[PDB]
Amino acid sequence: FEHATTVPNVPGIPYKALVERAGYAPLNLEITVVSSELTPSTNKEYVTCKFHTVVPSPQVKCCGSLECKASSKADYTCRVFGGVYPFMWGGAQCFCDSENTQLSEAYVEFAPDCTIDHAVALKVHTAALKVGLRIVYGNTTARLDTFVNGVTPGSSRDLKVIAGPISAAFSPFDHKVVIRKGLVYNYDFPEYGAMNPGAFGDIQASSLDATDIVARTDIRLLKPSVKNIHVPYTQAVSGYEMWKNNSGRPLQETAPFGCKIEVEPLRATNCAYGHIPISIDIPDAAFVRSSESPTILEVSCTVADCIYSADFGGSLTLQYKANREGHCPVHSHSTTAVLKEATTHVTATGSITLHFSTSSPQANFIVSLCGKKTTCNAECKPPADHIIGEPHKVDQEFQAAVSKTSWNWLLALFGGASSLIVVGLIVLVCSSMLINT
Amino acid sequence: FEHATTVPNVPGIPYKALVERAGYAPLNLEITVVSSELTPSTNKEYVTC
């Protein structure tokens, strides 16, 4: 049987319902999401790390001109110096006094320690929500992993489940993300090839082992001044360490909606947001005939010491006049109160205690012991514990968040004002009819 | 649950209260005052004979 209903996406917090398929008995249905994996689609532009700036030996040649060539190496910088006369140890290196040519060559390379301390840059496109569902119907359980889009039921060995599109589309990732060492940051890195010096993305490559490495660090080769052979060069500071110095907090600690983000693959787990429209196809095997299911005649309610906390704060004694021994479900129709127990064992003329979690100051709700309806009506005290360590099982709806006596006084004032208005219009009508006569 | 309660400070005469949380059964708090020593701050100022 196709049953469609809106359920919370929050992890835990069981959602219970009943199906009424004519004369096939009220059949219970407990569903609860236990995992919520939000996996976006990522493409990789570049990986970056601290660079090394390997500088080869100078090419000095003595009484000649040695203009250099271009190269495909990362951030190749060449300069040619005249009028040099270098000293290595043990004496001079040119037989020429003043006519010499020194070649200074400086490209840049990944550090040997970039196998770990490397950050990849990604763009996420669309968040795909995959949720795992625990279902118990009657006495049959089912673990089903389903995508939340409206199609692809997936695992249908016994049960068919369609997860409709979610009410609110939430994505904890911004359009550009950076992953280093298992930590994700919502950073706006530059495009591939748009390398600026002193900031993130100064050196880029598609992969760590790729020879196609690009960089635009401000490396400048200086004119050699001292007698001894070397290269003088001034470089802009690597923007990778500057980004590490002021990365802010990673997205595992700043993500909204209370969910935690893991890498390989990049996903967000247990994101509690919105409501999932669910559509279940309950098999007819679990359905039983209403003649076999015991019926019920008279049901009375008495709930004592209600408290509208997040816990199951309330005990109701519930009296029945049973027709026949048997186990059969129980359910509270009002969304404001949810029952701990889903199926009781009703035999003959007993009192059943039930635990319910509510959010209204008034406990005025409809409950079905194994069929029919029952109006539980009493009052609920405020919680004494200010902060509880578990989430609320009922969301407020403002239809019952105002207390019964508060509706009484507020509606009494409204009724007084409206009654004065009605008396005013009535006496205007009477006076108009009198002056018309 | 923290239950504030006013008790007379007479020796003997057992005092009785009920503690209760809405999801729990009531329990019989039994409080008795046995001794009450009024020891003040005393300093010796002289001795005579």
Ligand SMILES: *[C@@H]1O[C@H](CO)[C@@H](O)[C@H](O)[C@H]1NC(C)=O
């Ligand atoms: C960068 O590192 C230096 C070195 O100690 C530190 O003083 C500074 O607070 C860090 N952050 C910024 C934004 O300069």
